[PDB]
């Protein structure tokens, strides 16, 4: 099995402008949305059919109640942060909790908070401490670190509970998550600015989005400038990416245990 991750995000918006919900919370397995909740619907709902099909109604019912409470928690915590900064108007508060199951079977866990889209607090599950960006974050760190048992519950959640949920979700969504769609790759040559020859190595139709793309010269790394395209969703569940260079050249593509070489 390749590397996989489970993530739950929260977004709290103070004094929201018409249309923006005061609270949104979304779950992901890899780059796939799995769950959604916001302060308008006030309901936790599936966002993947393999989530809807495999979890009993009691799951959505129970987490609807929990998220209504976590929404209230986020509202009050953002009020307290604004008061600590002497901020008025609309501000944002975010959280990301989650874990990864690496291909070697090892695991990672993370829990981070942000204020106005910037790092604010980062949990270290190995020392049970919170890393603060400024004096305001330091005030929150001192309060959160004072409750030893809550730190222990958090470590347990990231290392055991989160990984157990990820393994269940990975089995539920195996037909999409554990599949492989190999890349369609081609090299395109073109004379651009007078005297300049451009080489474009373009990949598309691949899944998972994790791909390695590099340009080699005579079998060694190209110390010249390389431009990279973003890994973009093509809308059909597959992705596209590219790498380009200028003027024996070869494009090397690694995807899901398969190496591919396109010699110019």
């Amino acid at each position, epitope marked *: 099995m390749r590397t996989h991750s489970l993530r739950y995000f929260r977004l709290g918006v103070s004094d929201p402008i018409h249309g923006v919900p005061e609270f949104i919370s979304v779950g992901y397995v890899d780059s796939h949305p799995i769950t959604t909740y916001d302060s308008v619907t006030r309901q936790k709902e599936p966002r993947a059919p393999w989530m809807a099909e495999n979890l009993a109604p009691d*799951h959505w019912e129970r987490y609807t109640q929990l998220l209504r*409470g*976590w929404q209230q928690m986020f509202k009050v915590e953002l009020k307290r942060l604004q008061r600590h900064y002497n901020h008025s108007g609309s501000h944002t508060y975010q959280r990301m909790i989650g874990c990864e199951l690496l291909e070697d079977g090892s695991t990672t866990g993370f829990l981070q908070y942000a204020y106005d889209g910037q790092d604010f607090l980062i949990f270290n599950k190995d020392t049970l401490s919170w890393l603060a960006v400024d004096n305001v974050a330091h005030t929150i760190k001192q309060a959160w670190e004072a409750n030893q048992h809550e730190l*222990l519950y958090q470590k*347990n959640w990231l290392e*055991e509970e989160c990984i*157990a949920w990820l393994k269940r979700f990975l089995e539920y969504g195996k037909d999409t998550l554990q599949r492989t769609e190999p890349p369609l790759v081609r090299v395109n040559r073109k004379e651009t600015f007078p005297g300049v020859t451009a080489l474009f190595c373009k990949a598309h139709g691949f899944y998972p989005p994790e791909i390695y793309m590099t340009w080699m010269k005579n079998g060694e790394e190209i110390v010249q400038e390389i431009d990279y395209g973003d890994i973009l969703p093509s809308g059909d569940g597959t992705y596209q990416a590219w790498a380009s260079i200028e003027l024996l050249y070869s494009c090397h593509v690694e995807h899901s245990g398969v190496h591919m070489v396109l010699q110019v």
Partner: antibody
């Protein structure tokens, strides 16, 4: 979760020691709690464990084994005032409390 | 800091009753349990935060109202002899946090008779 087992009753002598066991089979685990409940009174929180180990609060020790799925509540230098019911409770994956039927502790003076 | 009333109450079958509960600890979550011989506590209804309530394990024959952050009342619509029990109101700072313990009220002894 589904099941929590703890003895119905335990008797031990004053000045001695008693270990109250609690085994659990749950749908996930977010911690185990011990509560003391004197006859006719409200339950009061004694302890919380979520990782492996033992913690001490006066004469009361609370241990947890994640691998074996059990906990014990250990009381040392037993006193008459320790006569009470001891409730074991586990929070499952969805933070729902699963309660044991309680252990009535009888102390022989 | 959990205040529960009444301590004792005799009811006739079909009669309606409200149990009051108030906490002054600034807790967000409130619960209603019933305790019966030879079994663990059983949740009737709970309220994870102000503005929401949901059924517990044994909700049939009851309803609740989270009136405000402080108060959570339990109602017996039409009392039945099976509803003879010891009722406990509880509160916690939040729900969905592992280490958070419960704070119990003094208990209400309800006896329902034909």
């Amino acid at each position: 979760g589904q099941n929590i087992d703890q003895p119905t009753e335990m008797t031990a002598t004053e000045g001695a020691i008693v270990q109250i066991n609690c085994t659990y089979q749950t749908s996930g685990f977010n911690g185990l709690f011990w509560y003391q409940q004197h006859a006719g009174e409200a339950p009061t929180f004694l302890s919380y464990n979520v990782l492996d180990g033992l913690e001490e609060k006066g004469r009361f020790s609370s241990f947890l084994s994640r691998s074996k799925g059990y906990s014990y509540l250990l009381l040392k230098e037993l006193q008459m005032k320790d006569s009470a019911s001891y409730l074991c409770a586990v929070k499952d994956s969805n933070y729902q409390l699963i309660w044991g039927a309680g252990t009535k502790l009888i102390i022989k003076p | 800091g959990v205040t529960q009333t009444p301590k004792f109450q005799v009811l006739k079958t079909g009669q309606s009753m409200t149990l009051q509960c108030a906490q002054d600890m600034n807790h967000n979550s409130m619960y209603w349990y019933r305790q019966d011989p030879g079994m663990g506590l059983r949740l009737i209804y709970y309220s994870a935060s102000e503005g929401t309530t949901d059924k517990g394990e044994v909700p049939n024959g009851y309803n609740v109202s989270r009136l405000n952050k402080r108060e959570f009342s339990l109602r017996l619509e039409s009392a039945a002899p099976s509803q003879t029990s010891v009722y406990f109101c509880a509160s916690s700072v939040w729900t969905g946090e592992g280490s958070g313990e419960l704070f119990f009220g003094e208990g209400s002894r309800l006896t329902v008779l034909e």
